[PDB]
Paper text:
HIV-1 reverse transcriptase (RT) (hereinafter referred to as RT) plays an essential role in the viral life cycle by reverse transcribing the single-stranded RNA genome to a double-stranded DNA copy. There are two main types of RT inhibitors: nucleoside RT inhibitors (NRTIs), which act as chain terminators and compete with incoming nucleotides in the polymerase active site, and non-nucleoside RT inhibitors (NNRTIs), which inhibit the activity of RT noncompetitively. NNRTIs are a group of structurally diverse compounds that bind to the non-nucleoside inhibitor-binding pocket (NNIBP) located ~10 Å from the polymerase active site. NNIBP is a hydrophobic pocket that emerges only when NNRTIs bind and induce conformational rearrangements of the residues defining the pocket.
Compound K-5a2 features a thiophene[3,2-d]pyrimidine central ring, and replaces the cyanophenyl right wing of ETR with a more extended piperidine-linked benzenesulfonamide group, while keeping the 4-cyano-2,6-dimethylphenyl structure in the left wing of ETR. Compared with ETR, compound K-5a2 displays much lower cytotoxicity and increased anti-HIV-1 potency against WT virus and virus strains with a variety of NNRTI-resistant mutations, except K103N and K103N/Y181C. In the structures of K103N RT in complex with 25a or K-5a2, the Lys to Asn substitution in RT shortens the aliphatic side chain and reduces the contact interface between residue 103 and the inhibitors, but 25a and K-5a2 are able to establish more contacts with Phe227 and Pro236 by varying their multiple torsion angles to counterbalance the loss. Interestingly, in the structure of K103N RT/K-5a2 complex, Tyr183 also undergoes a significant conformational change and is placed closer to the inhibitor, although it is still outside the contact radius of the cyano group in K-5a2. Superposition of the structures of WT RT/K-5a2, K103N RT/K-5a2, WT RT/25a, and K103N/Y181C RT/25a complexes reveals a gradual rotation of Tyr183 from the ‘down’ position in WT RT/K-5a2 complex to the ‘up’ position in K103N/Y181C RT/25a complex. This stepwise movement of Tyr183 is likely triggered by three factors: (i) inhibitor repositioning because of the K103N mutation, (ii) loss of aromatic interactions due to the Y181C or Y181I mutation, and (iii) presence of a cyanovinyl group in the inhibitor left wing.
Numbering used by the authors:
A (entry chain A): -1 to 554
B (entry chain B): 4 to 213, 227 to 428
Write the structure that this text describes.
């Protein structure tokens, strides 16, 4: 007998104040009972479960199930109730590596750790909670009662505890073999290296010798898979990676469910297929819960789809990461709040691609969206590669300098260079810091009746120009913007405008270049046409000339 | 210190479960090295999957230090940890500290590693060194001793500290020593030559009781509320008077008695913004009377220790930053302005981050606690970058201002 090391037990507890399950065993046919007795007798011989006396008061139901052609019964212990009552665990990370962060390992072996799993003992103090009962034939004897000694499949803690147990066992082998990589995925242990196949086979043998210290046998995975590996929705080849086939269906009729699957496919594709766009296809889902509601496609959603079909006609691939080369991220503006990017180390050889869509907002501008895209890519790059990329941005250095030195918020973007790839991001207007000499001065105001919703908007100027416009179905805030709009419409290329509207100032000081308000948009279009605009604010109802006059004109 | 002080969470609360944010490779490598040595010294231990808690960790560099340092973000654990009345009912915050001519800040967080943490509480200090690209599971640790940055540590360690210091205090009764989290604030009224000596005499005294060798030098000499000032001009344009009336209208929310009627009178009509208006005598008097009002302190300003301190910050341009600390609006307890932030002439976010730490330092000296910040920055930009410039061992709370305040002009 070769002594083997025990696998360290994880102490397990029920949630505070909760007891173990006490779920009644269902009745089963004579046929299923025979099947379950046979299965459990074999599990018992292998140490997986143990018979127990009648003192244990816990119970979880057991079932017997079949398959279409596989003509034998399967055991199923339903641990849902126990799972509700088991403590939380540090879970197996939901995150998986992104292929573009992987580095070349020419040699890979896949070991099956299915059998090692059953050497992981279940905390002895917890086993009582896993009791189950095989009902007896004709219910004329006591049911056969078992509990688990190993991690039950289907129980809440089994994946985290199995994974942690393997990691701890593998750790010394990994640290003393820095030229190999090891990655576990359920019963699959992937062991890779960039060594000549002979030296690699040796490391694999050394790994097997290591795991034997715990009595673990790990043979190669049945029916060794030829390249590429089909992993987590990717195709991993020795020197390149892509997503698995992206096939967009043809359809006369699209439902809310069909469009969801389409965006998901498109979103999956967008990590390597550059320029994918999903706005017009997502706009068809705004607010609806009926998933069979046939939503006709807009001519803009058809265009978008057709554009994505073109992008998807041919497979593209990414390359793996080379730590010795620089990491570069390039961004393009696509329109309607959409942005695309490529990350690469060599021109024309993308590590991966991606996209970024404008946040929901009343107002926005292109420089803010570009900044947000940069922050997203920055964070994604730190995740994948542990470093910020150098950026190539379609914004002139002088445009950026003007923006951040004058913008009221702090803002930053990391090391970057201009790439002259239209359309370029620009500032569409800039207000003056001081009043303009020789420019006419418009005092603007608007007001509305809260009940009738009737309003007025207008201005008076130092040249005696004046305008008041009656308005229907409006609000104070809206009349205040309308007044500014009228002053812009009716002035020369240089204009001083005086408002008392804190609402209007707050909007314009935010420097939007687009809005969900047509009126704000009309004001932006006027600003773009001016040469110089000074916008000044005064408190309302303080007797300030000009302002007092127009306030009267519009307040009835 | 063999005996551990029992510590619990607040009633009905579980431990923190805060996501670890992604870290650069150089920071990960630094944390691996630091934590390997800490594990060898017994300060932390690897934990298993039965521990589901987490607190974020990152790596910093103290002001002018090339050695990486581990910083655990215990903000969630601290709010979940029982309130402490450790050895008494509380240490009344020393009002004399802010009056000392010089205050030196000493990092004494290393002292915490000599006290063991309550064995039943350790699981709540769990933290993860993350992997790059999710390629390995994070390295999972918990603390065995009092951790730096945790609310419990100064509280549990306070008996040991007061004894370590008593001989020094007995000898220097005029030096104020105040502890906040991992820091000691040592103030006196001597010249830096004697003060440095004392400071070096204190760390030596600390080294003989079981350090760092670093120190920050503050001069809370003139920390006050900066007066509202009005322009003094020989010729006022329409625009100048409009700006003055707006500023006075704002000041009128703070100060009773502010009047603008006579100044508004000057703007009778619909005048060009650049037209020069002569001040009448009535308007000159009104402006002088406002000027006199603004020389007095604001009425009914008092600190209420049961309420949060609020700090607002404005970017003024050209490396200048203004800020106000208050508990209720228009009742400023302190106002200030910073310029030429060190080492960030081209980086807004670095400047803002340094202003946030300076203000927090001032807040600890004056009131013994940190303010909640209203930051003029988009959340995504701040969250991406602030850890890159952080140099303090505490971290305050903050929220984001997305609408430009009209008042930036008035603090201009
Ligand atoms: C080893 C492994 C396999 C799979 C799968 N499925 C997934 C992950 C996450 C794995 O884990 C790691 N993978 C790597 N690199 C990659 C680089 C690209 N290839 C694909 C390939 C190469 C050679 C052959 S071949 N010629 O032998 O047939 C076939 C397929 C696999 C290894 N790096 C790390 C670092 C830490 S974990 C980890
Ligand atoms: Mg009005």
């Amino acid at each position: 007998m070769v002594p083997i090391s025990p696998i360290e037990t994880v102490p397990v507890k029920l949630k505070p104040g909760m007891d173990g399950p006490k779920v009644k065993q269902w009745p089963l046919t004579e046929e299923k009972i025979k099947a379950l007795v046979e299965i459990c007798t074999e599990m018992e011989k292998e140490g997986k479960i143990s018979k127990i006396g009648p003192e244990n008061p816990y119970n979880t139901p057991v079932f017997a199930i079949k398959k279409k052609d596989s003509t034998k019964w399967r055991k199923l212990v339903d641990f849902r109730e126990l799972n509700k009552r088991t403590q939380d665990f540090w879970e197996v990370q939901l995150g998986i590596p992104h292929p573009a962060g992987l580095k070349k390992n020419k040699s890979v072996t896949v070991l099956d750790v299915g059998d090692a799993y059953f050497s992981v003992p279940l905390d002895e103090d917890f086993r009582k909670y896993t009791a189950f009962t095989i009902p007896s034939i004709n219910n004329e004897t006591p049911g056969i009662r078992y509990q688990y000694n190993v991690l039950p499949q289907g129980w809440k803690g089994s994946p985290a505890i199995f994974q942690s147990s393997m990691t701890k066992i593998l750790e010394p082998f990994a640290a003393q073999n820095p030229d190999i990589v090891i990655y576990q995925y359920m019963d699959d242990l992937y062991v890779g290296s960039d060594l000549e196949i002979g030296q690699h086979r040796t490391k694999i043998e050394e790994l097997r010798q290591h795991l034997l210290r715990w009595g673990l046998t790990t043979p190669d995975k049945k029916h060794q898979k030829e390249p590429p590996f089909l992993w987590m929705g990717y195709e991993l080849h020795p020197d390149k990676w892509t997503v698995q086939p992206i096939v967009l269906p043809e359809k006369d009729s699209w439902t809310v469910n069909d469009i969801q699957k389409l965006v998901g496919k498109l979103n999956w594709a967008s990590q390597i297929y550059p320029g994918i766009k999903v706005r017009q296809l997502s706009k068809l889902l705004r607010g609806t819960k009926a998933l069979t509601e046939v939503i006709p496609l807009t001519e803009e959603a058809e265009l978008e789809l057709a554009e994505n079909r073109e992008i998807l006609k041919e497979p593209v691939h990414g390359v793996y990461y080379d730590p010795s080369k620089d990491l570069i991220a390039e961004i393009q503006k696509q329109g309607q709040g959409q942005w695309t990017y490529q990350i690469y180390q060599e021109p024309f050889k993308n590590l991966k691609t991606g996209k970024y869509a404008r946040m929901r907002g009343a107002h926005t501008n292109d420089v803010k969206q570009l900044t947000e895209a940069v922050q997203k890519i920055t964070t994604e790059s730190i995740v994948i590669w542990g470093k910020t990329p150098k950026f190539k941005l379609p914004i002139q250095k002088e445009t950026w300098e003007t923006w951040w030195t004058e913008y009221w918020q702090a803002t930053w973007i990391p090391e970057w260079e201009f790439v002259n790839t239209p359309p370029l991001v620009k500032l569409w207007y800039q207000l003056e810091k001081e009043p303009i000499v020789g420019a006419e001065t418009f005092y603007v105001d608007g007001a509305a009746n809260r009940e009738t919703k009737l309003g007025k908007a207008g201005y008076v100027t130092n040249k005696g120009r004046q305008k008041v416009v009656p308005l229907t179905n409006t609000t104070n805030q809206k009349t205040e913007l309308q007044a500014i709009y009228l002053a812009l419409q009716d002035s020369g290329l240089e204009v001083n405008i005086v408002t008392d509207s804190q609402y209007a100032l707050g909007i314009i000081q935010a420097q939007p270049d687009k809005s969900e308000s047509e009126l704000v948009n009309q004001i932006i279009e006027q600003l773009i046409k001016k040469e110089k605009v000074y916008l000044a604010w005064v408190p309302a109802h303080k007797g300030i000339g000009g302002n007092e006059q127009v306030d009267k004109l519009v307040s009835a | 210190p063999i005996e551990t002080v029992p510590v619990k969470l607040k009633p009905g609360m579980d431990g923190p479960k805060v996501k670890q944010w992604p870290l650069t490779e150089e920071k990960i490598k630094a944390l691996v090295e630091i934590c390997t040595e800490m594990e060898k010294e017994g300060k932390i231990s690897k934990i298993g999957p039965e521990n589901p808690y987490n607190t974020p960790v990152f790596a910093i560099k103290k002001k002018d230090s090339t050695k990486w340092r581990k910083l655990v973000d215990f903000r969630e654990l601290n709010k979940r940890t029982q309130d402490f009345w450790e050895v008494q009912l509380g240490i009344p915050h020393p009002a004399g500290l802010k009056k000392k001519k010089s205050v030196t800040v000493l990092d004494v967080g290393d002292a915490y590693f000599s006290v063991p943490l309550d064995e039943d509480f350790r699981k709540y200090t769990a933290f993860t060194i993350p992997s790059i690209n999710n390629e390995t599971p994070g390295i999972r640790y918990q603390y065995n001793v009092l951790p730096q940055g945790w609310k419990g540590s100064p509280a549990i360690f306070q008996s040991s500290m007061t004894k370590i210091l008593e001989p020094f205090k007995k000898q220097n009764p005029d030096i104020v020593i105040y502890q906040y989290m991992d820091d000691l604030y040592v103030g006196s009224d001597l010249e830096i030559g004697q003060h440095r000596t004392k400071i070096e005499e204190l760390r030596q005294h600390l080294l003989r009781w079981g350090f760092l060798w670093m120190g920050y030098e503050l001069h809370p000499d003139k920390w006050t509320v900066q007066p509202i000032v009005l322009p003094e001009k020989d010729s006022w344009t329409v625009n100048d008077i409009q700006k003055l009336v707006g500023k006075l209208n704002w000041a009128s929310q703070i100060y009773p008695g502010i009047k603008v009627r006579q100044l508004s009178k000057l703007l009778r009509g619909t005048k060009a913004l650049t037209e020069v208006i002569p001040l009448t005598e009535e308007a000159e008097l009104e402006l002088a009377e406002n000027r006199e009002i603004l020389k007095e302190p604001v009425h009914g300003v008092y600190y209420d220790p049961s309420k949060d301190l609020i700090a607002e910050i404005q970017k003024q341009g050209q490396g200048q930053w203004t800020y106000q600390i208050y508990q209720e609006p228009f009742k400023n307890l302190k106002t200030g302005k910073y310029a030429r932030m060190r080492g960030a002439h081209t980086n807004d976010v670095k400047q803002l981050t340094e202003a946030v730490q300076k203000i927090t330092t001032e807040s600890i000296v004056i009131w013994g606690k940190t303010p909640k910040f209203k930051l003029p920055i988009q959340k995504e930009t701040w969250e991406t970058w602030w850890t890159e410039y952080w140099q303090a061992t505490w971290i305050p709370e903050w929220e984001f201002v997305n609408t430009p305040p009209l008042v930036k002009l008035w603090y201009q």
